[PDB]
């Protein structure tokens, strides 16, 4: 029942598709060679429209400016919640903040979930989320308690492929780097989507990929659910960066379904576990008519 | 890192676990011909058994009971614990254990194993972090087994377990 | 004794050290993934002046032009001898008739790179002592002295098995593209010809790799380095000629502006003298 603010200060960038080779060098450096960078928050998502990179300042200094690269004028912050499933956090945070007309970006991970808000909109967060969560701020690796200061529609499209969410042993990545580099760099040169998600946060790996790309890798070095469950995607589009994860999470907050929100420069995604998609085409569509 | 373990009932055996398992025997032989490894100026060791059937082990734990006498709980690097026996006795009273596979719902890295002093049938394991999982699982020894007894520690990582002896 | 003219046509390129990062994608493409690019002759050498790149025509289209790339105006072709002796048989007669020759050596064979405009000269002279064959469709068919510098480093010649490349690819990438920014020279040699691997690297960098997978001499012998300067782009003859007389085993590597020779560590104290005599 506690809110944590973390010390990361992130930067959100969109990279054009053909211009990937220009920024290849820092990309692979950040992915596979941690000793050469001070990065501690790195995440990458690939979409047919464009690429998205969330990286902190130390990693931001490594990207050479050019015209393929667009930078958003904000320094987002990271919030975490410790105690509380996806429905609980969605209902407890996303809706109240959206009532006060502020934008929120969601990134999920095989381990935890992260929430991104703007730096000049921190007072409103402390105001609205002080009645449930005990806000602590992490300064110098120690949570200093923040006393409550007296501060007074878009079309829906659903692809038809299946996705596998898994993690990795951080020692094993050397035995996989080559097979990974193809999928990231050399493969890309209506009822189907090409989707990939790679994120490295505080020494942990989370990957999202479709079942098609999955046979390429050896099976024993991938760590996924034993039963073998798959997922399915729902996505809604719009304008590039009152937020867009609201129009998915809110209507999905009137039930109990485990979502996997991933936000992009232009899209806003969500994953459901296969068995439950005859119902998320029900609540969504039936809310897309009134 | 490689580890050592003392046998809990026999005073002359111990195992070495670096990349495979190996049973030794403390042969007290000073006034003799040294066959065999040089432990000290009056003792030597002899390889009674060896096994290399598992890759990427993480932790081990001796069995505290009497009849099987060589049950070893090898905690692997994908979440699953496997019970391995390194003896030669053959059919004892419990010929059914010698190889189980306790799997958690999702696969992470194992960190710690344990054993109750008082009731030998309980085996606590500690696993890594997850978004919808329990981290402290208490099993019961009596792919195959998927329902543990007591599940604690939701959404956290456990790094050490120690049963209280009271 | 028979000579062979192979099917390969090669372009020799040099890239400036600051501007390497632009050419990483084509380089890794060529060097690590065989099923993606149709290439059969790749080799790369690290030198303080620049990097030296000699590839065939299919791989030439991958490299885009820039402000840190220079290309030789002519086209080379590869000659091989199959049947010490090499210098006394091909180079000295070739140099006697004013023909520029580039030499690349591998853990398996030697390669001699003559110009393509000079085919008649290169084989009218050399045909008296050699049987000349040309490979078509995969089937053979009948037809100003500079000073000598001696770096103090050590070196090792090597080979690997192709199945194990990705198990070391990360270390290779580190060394080439990340671990970079009168002695202590930086020298690295990598070549991929007809599906074969040759590596030359100093003993200091050898410790990083797992020393049970790299295949080398089963004694521990290491080589030593002799260098000669040069402005253009015949400079290799100035080492080979004066060194074939003593009948010593060598290992020649030529670059854009410099020529290299490798001699075993046991008898380094004579190759220096042999060129001090002149």
What does this structure look like?
- The structure is cut from a larger assembly and holds 2 copies of chain A and 1 copy of chain B (166 residues).
- With 290 residues, chain A is of the alpha+beta class.
- Chain A contains 8 helices and 16 strands.
- Chain A has a 7-stranded antiparallel beta sheet with strand order 5-2-4-3-13-14-12.
- The longest helix of chain A is centred in the first third of the chain and has 14 residues.
- Chain B is mainly β.
- Chain B starts with a strand and ends in a 12-residue tail after the last strand.
- Chains in contact: A-B, A-C.
* Terminal Cα span of chain A: 34 Å
Number of distinct helices of chain A: 8
List the quaternary state of the chains: part of a larger assembly
Name the chain pair whose interface involves the most residues: A-C, 18 and 18 residues
What fraction, in percent, of the residue positions of chain A are helical?
Answer: 10-25%
Rg of chain A (CA only): 19 Å
Major beta-sheet overview of chain A: 7 strands, antiparallel
Structural class estimated from helices and strands of chain B: mainly beta
How helix-rich are the residues of chain B, as a percent range?
under 10%
- The termini of chain B sit apart by 31 Å
**How many strand elements of chain A?**
16
Overall shape of chain A: it is globular
**Helical element count of chain B?**
0
InterPro entries (chain A): ACT-like_dom_sf, CASTOR1_ACT-like, CASTOR1_N, CASTOR_ACT_dom, CASTOR_fam, CASTOR_mTORC1
Subcellular location (chain A): Cytoplasm, Cytosol
Protein name (chain A): Cytosolic arginine sensor for mTORC1 subunit 1
Keywords (chain A): Cytoplasm, Phosphoprotein, Ubl conjugation
Tags for this model:
part of a larger assembly; 3 chains; A: 290 residues; alpha+beta; seven-stranded antiparallel sheet; globular; B: mainly beta; four-stranded antiparallel sheet; 34% strand; elongated
């Amino acid at each position: 029942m506690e809110l944590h603010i973390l010390e990361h200060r992130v930067r959100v960038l969109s990279v054009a598709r053909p211009g990937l080779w220009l920024y290849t060098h820092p990309l692979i450096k950040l992915l596979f060679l941690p000793r050469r960078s001070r990065c501690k928050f790195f995440s990458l998502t690939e979409t047919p429209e464009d690429y998205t990179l969330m990286v902190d300042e130390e990693g931001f200094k490594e990207l050479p400016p050019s015209e393929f690269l667009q930078v958003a004028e904000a320094t987002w912050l990271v919030l975490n919640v410790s105690s509380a499933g996806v429905t609980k956090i969605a209902r407890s945070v996303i809706a109240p903040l959206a009532e006060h007309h502020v934008s929120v970006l969601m990134l999920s991970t095989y381990q935890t979930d992260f929430i991104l808000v703007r730096e000049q909109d921190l007072s409103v967060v402390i105001h609205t989320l002080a009645q449930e969560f005990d806000i602590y701020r992490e300064v110098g690796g120690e949570p200093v308690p923040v006393t409550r200061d007296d501060s007074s529609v878009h079309p829906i499209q659903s692809p038809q492929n299946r996705f596998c969410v898994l993690t990795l042993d951080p020692e094993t990545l050397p035995a996989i780097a080559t097979t990974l580099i193809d999928v990231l760099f050399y493969s890309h040169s209506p009822s189907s989507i090409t989707f990939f998600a790679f994120s490295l946060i505080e020494g942990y790996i989370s990957i999202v990929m479709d079942a098609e790309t999955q046979k390429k890798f050896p099976s024993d070095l991938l760590l996924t659910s034993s039963s073998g469950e798959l997922w399915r995607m729902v996505r809604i589009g719009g304008q590039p960066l009152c937020g867009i994860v609201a129009q998915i999470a809110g209507p999905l907050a009137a039930a109990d379904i485990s979502a996997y929100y991933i936000s992009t420069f232009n899209f806003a995604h969500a994953l459901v576990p296969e068995d439950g998609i005859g119902s998320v085409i029900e609540v969504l569509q039936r809310r897309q008519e009134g | 890192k490689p580890d050592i373990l003392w046998a809990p009932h026999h005073v002359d055996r111990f195992v070495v676990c670096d990349s495979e398992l190996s049973l030794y025997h403390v042969e007290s032989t000073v006034n003799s011909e040294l066959k065999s490894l040089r432990l000290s100026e009056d003792s030597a060791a002899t390889l009674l058994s060896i096994n290399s059937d598992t890759p990427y082990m993480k932790c081990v734990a001796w069995y505290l009971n009497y009849d099987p006498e060589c049950l070893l709980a090898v905690g692997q690097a994908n979440g699953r614990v496997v019970l391995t026996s390194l003896g030669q006795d053959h059919n004892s009273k419990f010929k059914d254990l010698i190889g189980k596979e306790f799997v958690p719902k999702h696969a992470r890295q194992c960190n710690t194993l344990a054993w109750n002093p008082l009731d030998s049938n309980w085996l606590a394991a500690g696993l890594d972090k997850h978004r919808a999982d329990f981290s402290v699982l208490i099993w019961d020894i009596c792919l195959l087994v998927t329902k543990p007894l007591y599940e604690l520690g939701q959404n956290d990582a456990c790094l050490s377990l120690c049963w209280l002896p009271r």
